[PDB]
Design a protein around this ligand. Structure first.
Ligand SMILES: [Zn+2]
Ligand SMILES: [Zn+2]
Length: 612
RNA sequence: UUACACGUGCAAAAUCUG
């Protein structure tokens, strides 16, 4: 044929997404005796960068040398991109440094090469050199350096780039705007991200995903879910990257139903084999009270990274299956998956909630010797949690002081919560004091100390701690348990008499306590922390938040149906005993969550073995 | 005049009285 005919065929396949066809035609063209020129090399090199075929890229680079195209800006810039997309920033920089003449694209190719290979600062440094040479940026430049800002978190740098974008007339480019959304979220300004998102003239799925990820990562899970529904309302179809962030919001909200819907979408749309989708699925099921479904997703997973293992390890940890979490960590090492810091936080949390004191000390002490993992403040908080639940409050406080980190509200709150369980009034005062200096607005140290005093019979003291809370304007979030029945969650506080079906819920509670009394249940009043006679103390135990949520569940669901209840507070001992009696009385498996840990009541016992 | 583009999931604690 001709060089034009060969170039047009190669050009078509290189930009269409058929890099091997472009390279096969390159070989046939060379065998044919047709000499490729500067209109062949950029598209053939583009195909190499697409396939990351470094060996062929150097082969074509050799052809460029022999053909005498070393001074061509198009050929050299394609060489920069090829080496950069092949993970060879050194050779990409050597091409860039030796170009006798470059343009914006050659600068963009090198800057994108740095930013795309975990090299965000050398990208910004080259971008700053670009101003000193008076090179006008393009939409590609601003899109690439905004991705570097997002990775580094420099908001003031990105604020300057956003301004430069507007002054350069690129604010309506969908790529540039998508970068601004991701940058602003990753830099801590979710509001500036929403402003760019709202003012956008055109929004792809990347636009909706970057906004939703920014919300779910920032705690606003109700809003990421609302934008997911609004995205479907506008006819935008989520890809395989949208659902992981969406499922992470379902896990935070206990939206077991919602998360089930996404799983059906995942099956229908062929995303079932994606690691991110699988890791988000096991995390969703676990945080929603279904360790069984979480294990099923982990089993069927065709491929697993360290996050998929860490998610299932944290799944067992949160559900009190400490031993099972430790078997998984061993198969991780046998299957050649190195443990991260997130791995050790999860297995240490598993040992804490399951009482594996010996094993918890082993993995913690062996975390840095036998593994490159160095201790974060989260691993020490796990140890304070482990010792606190084992009753070793002296070792817990001594670890807090000797900690190579500055103590926080979590690590002292762990000790304070443990003092509540074991009745250490003195240590409770000390722990509550250190929390108030760290944060004076947290209502937890007040109610905790008020509960500690009231448990000790120090009513006058407890009244003053409650008095001091009301005068400092400290507001506490109501302890409540909710239960999803027919896609409608149902919130219940202790002694709640505001529910529509209150009289049938309470009559059910009366019928239940009748059977519980015959089964041998005797409520103790030492667990009631109110200075009230015995007649109302047993009545107060009867109407706790989860006891209302159970009573509503078994009057609105068929008999024998498993019930799930999510609370924001730890269950007391007598209510843990009462739910054990209820589990066999009603013939159901009742899954109740504390602040984080899950209980499983079945056939008259709980999976925690009365250790939580 | 070719070449250069953006979005990912897994981290320890506490509120039974709002
Ligand atoms: Zn209770
Ligand atoms: Zn239990």
């Amino acid at each position: 044929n001709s060089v034009f005919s060969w170039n047009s065929k190669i050009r078509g396949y290189a930009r269409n997404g058929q890099p091997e066809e472009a390279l096969s035609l390159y070989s046939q063209m060379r065998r044919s005796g047709i000499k490729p020129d500067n209109y062949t090399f950029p598209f053939v090199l583009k195909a190499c960068a697409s396939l990351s075929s470094l060996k062929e890229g150097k082969q074509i680079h050799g052809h460029v040398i022999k053909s005498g195209f070393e001074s061509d800006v198009y050929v050299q810039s394609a060489l920069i991109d090829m080496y950069a997309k092949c993970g060879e920033l050194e050779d990409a920089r050597k091409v860039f440094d030796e170009m006798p003449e470059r343009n914006v694209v050659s600068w963009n190719a090198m800057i994108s090469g740095y930013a795309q290979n975990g090299q965000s600062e050398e990208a910004l440094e080259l971008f700053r050199e670009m101003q000193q040479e008076g090179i006008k940026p393009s939409e590609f430049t601003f899109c690439s350096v905004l991705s570097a800002c997002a990775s580094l978190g420099s908001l003031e740098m990105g604020k300057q780039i956003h301004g430069y974008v507007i002054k350069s007339g690129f604010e309506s480019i969908v790529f540039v705007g998508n970068a601004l959304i991701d940058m602003y979220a990753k830099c801590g300004s979710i509001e500036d991200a929403r402003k760019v998102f709202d003012e956008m003239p055109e929004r792809t799925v990347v636009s909706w995903t970057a906004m939703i990820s920014g919300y779910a990562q920032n705690g606003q899970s109700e809003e990421a879910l609302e934008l997911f529904r609004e995205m479907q309302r506008e006819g935008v179809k989520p890809d395989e990257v949208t659902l992981p962030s969406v499922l992470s919001a379902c896990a935070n909200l206990g939206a077991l139903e919602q998360g089930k819907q996404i799983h059906a979408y995942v099956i229908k749309s062929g995303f079932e084999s994606d690691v991110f989708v699988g890791s988000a699925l096991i995390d969703m099921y676990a945080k929603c009270g279904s360790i069984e479904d979480a294990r099923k997703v982990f089993d069927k997973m065709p491929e697993r990274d360290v996050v998929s293992w860490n998610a299932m390890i944290a799944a067992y940890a949160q559900h009190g299956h400490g031993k099972e979490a430790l078997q998984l960590f061993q198969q991780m090492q046998q299957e050649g998956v190195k443990p991260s810091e997130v791995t050790f936080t999860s297995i240490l949390s598993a040992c804490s909630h399951a009482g594996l004191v010996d094993e918890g000390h082993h993995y913690f002490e062996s975390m840095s010797p036998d593994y490159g993992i160095t201790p974060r403040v989260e691993h020490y908080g796990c140890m304070v949690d482990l010792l606190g639940r084992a009753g070793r409050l002296d070792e817990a406080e001594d670890l807090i002081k000797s900690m190579p980190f500055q103590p926080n509200v979590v690590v002292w709150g762990t000790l304070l919560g443990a003092c509540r369980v074991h009745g250490d009034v003195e240590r409770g005062e000390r722990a509550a004091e250190r929390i108030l200096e760290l944060d004076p607005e947290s209502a937890a140290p007040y109610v905790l100390l008020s509960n500690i005093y009231a448990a000790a019979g120090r009513w006058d003291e407890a009244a003053k701690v409650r008095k001091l809370m009301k005068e400092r304007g400290v507001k506490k979030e109501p302890g409540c348990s909710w239960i999803e029945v027919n896609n409608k969650v149902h919130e219940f506080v202790a002694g709640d008499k505001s529910h529509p079906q209150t009289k049938e819920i309470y009559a059910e509670l009366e019928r239940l306590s009748k059977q519980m009394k015959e089964a041998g249940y005797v409520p103790d009043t030492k667990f009631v922390l109110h200075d009230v006679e015995e007649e109302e103390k047993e009545q107060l135990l009867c109407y706790h938040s989860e006891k209302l949520a159970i009573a509503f569940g078994l009057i609105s669901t068929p008999p024998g149906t498993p019930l799930r209840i999510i609370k924001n507070l730890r269950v007391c001992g007598d209510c843990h005993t009462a739910t054990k009696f209820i589990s066999k009385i009603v013939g159901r498996e009742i899954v109740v969550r504390d602040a984080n840990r899950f209980h499983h009541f079945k056939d008259g016992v709980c999976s925690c073995g009365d250790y939580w």
